[model samples]
Target: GKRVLIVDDAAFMRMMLKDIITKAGYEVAGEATNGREAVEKYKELKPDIVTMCITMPEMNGIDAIKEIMKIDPNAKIIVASAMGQQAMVIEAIKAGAKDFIVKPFQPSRVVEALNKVS
Candidate 1:
């Protein structure tokens, strides 16, 4: 099963994703609210997959993705994005985020994206 680091400022988002991924059999390796913590946690936990949230405090998801990719060029990241965030999501892809899921997060779509990416 894949192990995942879930990052989001909202506890709801974190819990929601954790539940979906766990149901899909991925381990909840670690949780981080903001990008700084996400970056550090990613280093320590070294999950097979990451679910990144853009528009976070301290640092944003796109920058965090860049930092993580610097640490692991082949890093696998799945950014959960919102509408009207295309520029940021596209930049994330260029920065090495493997794929992104759109919000508002539907359970099947979230799981399906994870299915394809992980």
Candidate 2:
């Protein structure tokens, strides 16, 4: 089973994703409230996948994706973006995020993206 690190400043959002991923049989390796912590956890936990929030307080997701890519070019990241954040999502992809799922998340889509990327 792949381990996933869920990153989001909102506890509700993280919990929502945790439930979906867990029910899908993926392990939740760790959680990060911001992109900075996401990068650090990526190094420590070495999770197989990452679900990153596009906008964060410290070091937004795109920059974090770049930083993680610097650490491991083959790192797998799936950006979680809110509605109307298409440009940021594209930037995230350019920075090495493998895929993306829009907010108001659909459980099936989330699992599908995770599986596809992992």
Candidate 3:
């Protein structure tokens, strides 16, 4: 089972992802409300994977990915995006995100993405 760090500003989104991943048997390493915290937690937890949201205060996901990759090139990251954020999602992947899950996520879809990268 993989351990996952969830990064999102929205409590609801965090809860949603936590529910889905936990139900799928993955451990929730921790949660971060913003990318700065995300980077800090990444260093501390070193989770097997991370699910990061694009828009957030104090260092958006792309910059956080850049920062994290600076420390660990092999970090596995998944971006959680909404419809019409394709450009940002693509940018995230280019910056080292392993995959992505669209907003209003389907539990099955999230599981599929996790398995693909896990």
lDDT of 2 by residue, 32-109 (tens): 999889989999999999999998997888888999999998899999989999999999998898899988889999
* Local accuracy of candidate 1 as per-residue lDDT tens digits, 1-118: 4888999999988887888888877789999999899989989988888999888999999999999999988789998877899999899888898888876788888788777886
Q: By TM-score, how accurate is candidate 3?
A: 0.97
Q: Considering summed lDDT, which 10 consecutive residues are worst modelled in model 1?
A: 109-118
lDDT of each: 0.87, 0.93, 0.94
* Candidate 1, residue 34: how far the Cα is off, in Å: 1.0
What are the clashing pairs of model 3?
none
Query: Quick one: how many clashes does candidate 2 have?
Result: 0
User: Which candidate, 1 or 2, would have the higher TM-score against the true structure?
Assistant: 2
- What is the C-alpha lDDT profile of model 3 across 1-118, one tens digit per residue? 4999999999999999999999998899999999999999999999999999999998899999999999899899999988999999999999999899999989999999889997
True lDDT of residue 64, candidate 3? 95
TM-score of 1: 0.94
Distance from true location, Cα of 74 in model 3, Å: 0.7
